[PDB]
Design an enzyme around this catalytic site. Structure first.
Site, short mmCIF file in Angstrom:
data_model
loop_
_atom_site.label_atom_id
_atom_site.label_comp_id
_atom_site.label_asym_id
_atom_site.label_seq_id
_atom_site.Cartn_x
_atom_site.Cartn_y
_atom_site.Cartn_z
N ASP A 186 38.84 42.63 50.09
CA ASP A 186 39.07 43.85 49.33
C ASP A 186 38.71 45.10 50.12
O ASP A 186 37.52 45.38 50.30
CB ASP A 186 38.25 43.76 48.04
CG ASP A 186 38.70 44.77 47.00
OD1 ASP A 186 39.87 45.24 47.15
OD2 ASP A 186 37.85 45.34 46.30
ZN ZN Z 1 39.80 46.48 45.53
#
Ligand code: ZN
Ligand code: MAN
Ligand code: MAN
Ligand code: ZN
Ligand code: ZN
Ligand code: ZN
Length: 325
Positions: free
Chosen positions: A32
């Protein structure tokens, strides 16, 4: 030192997982670029929570960071918290023995019931890590000075394994030149400012906007004014509430969405904005572009990234974009 690791998407590219060696156990993490914590599933969890997931097993040399703790929440009512360890982490050949590992001993439904996903690897700026009392460095940040160049690149593929490059650029992954833009790390994210956008063959919008590159997000979240202008070109589209956002006939092919970055055109094929059916065998299809209302921030997620080779360069800082090979 440099390295590359393969990333495979789940179902309809809803979350890309990547093998990562944490401690002695191999896990499958979600990379992420929108967060800065590295947390995994720990033995401390409920057995019924553990099921369907590889759990983190400390090394013989690891060291528990006594007194420290971590707690994080995401886009929805999705939390996770737990303890912190100093172990060895290996991603694509690049190894480090001083990486902070955030063990979870309490998490939300979304996580538990997402068998296979074994946690997250945050690649945003370390300033927003959530460990306490002292924030910790992300993995990239921690191995930065071991890398031939202080950067990493990503190549996400649609319904096919992509790749994450650490410390170098693989020229066989893009065609034409890399265009660079200045990254805004003001909020701890890899932000940038597109000069405009273009719907289909329409005329580009000089009006720019502020966006972040978040690999951890499936869709393209933009301001309602833009979304509304987009779907206005998609016949039969409707704001189907009780479904999330706009929908349209699966048989319909939506127009491309172009993101202008300086003189570069990052074109998202219309085919990718036809995300997927709202239900198994459904007749209607969910759109790749929805509203960012509720976050107040524009996000260019996996749907946008599935067509670009993106370079995250700590020098500047800056982001580079090139048409995926
Ligand atoms: Zn994210
Ligand atoms: C404890 O863990 C480390 C990391 O795998 C090993 O090097 C050691 O031999 C023992 O298994
Ligand atoms: C979407 O498709 C419809 C077909 O009825 C057109 O009328 C519209 O202009 C758009 O191309
Ligand atoms: Zn090297
Ligand atoms: Zn796994
Ligand atoms: Zn096209």
């Amino acid at each position: 030192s440099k390295g590359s690791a393969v990333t495979t998407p789940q179902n309809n590219d809803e979350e890309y997982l990547t093998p990562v060696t944490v401690g002695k156990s191999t896990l499958h993490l979600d990379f992420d670029t929108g967060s800065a914590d590295l947390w995994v599933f720990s033995d401390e969890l409920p057995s019924s929570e553990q099921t369907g997931h590889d759990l983190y097993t400390p090394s013989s040399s690891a060291t528990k960071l006594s007194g420290y703790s971590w707690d994080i929440s995401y886009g929805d009512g999705s939390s996770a918290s737990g303890d912190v360890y100093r172990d060895t982490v290996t991603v694509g050949g690049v190894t480090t023995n001083k990486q902070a590992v955030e063990a979870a001993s309490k998490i939300s439904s979304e996580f538990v019931q997402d068998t296979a996903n074994d946690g997250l690897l945050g690649l945003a700026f370390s300033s927003i890590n959530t460990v306490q009392p002292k924030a910790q460095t992300t993995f990239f940040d921690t191995v930065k000075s071991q890398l031939d160049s202080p950067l990493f690149a990503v190549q996400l593929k649609h319904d096919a394994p992509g790749v994450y490059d650490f410390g170098y650029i693989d020229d066989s992954k893009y065609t034409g030149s890399i265009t660079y833009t200045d990254a805004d790390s003001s909020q701890g994210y890899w932000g940038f400012s597109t000069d405009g956008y273009s719907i289909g063959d329409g005329s580009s919008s000089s009006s720019g906007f502020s966006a972040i590159a978040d690999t951890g997000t499936t869709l393209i979240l933009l301001d309602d004014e833009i979304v509304s202008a987009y779907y206005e070109q998609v016949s039969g589209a409707q704001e189907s509430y009780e479904a999330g956002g706009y929908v349209f006939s699966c048989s319909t092919d939506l127009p491309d969405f172009t993101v202008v970055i300086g003189d570069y055109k990052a074109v998202v094929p219309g085919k990718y904005i036809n995300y997927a059916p709202v239900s198994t065998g459904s007749s209607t299809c969910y759109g790749g572009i929805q509203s960012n209302s509720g976050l107040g921030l524009s996000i260019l997620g996996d749907v946008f990234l599935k067509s670009q080779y993106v370079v995250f360069n700590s020098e500047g800082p800056k982001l580079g974009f090139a048409a995926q090979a």
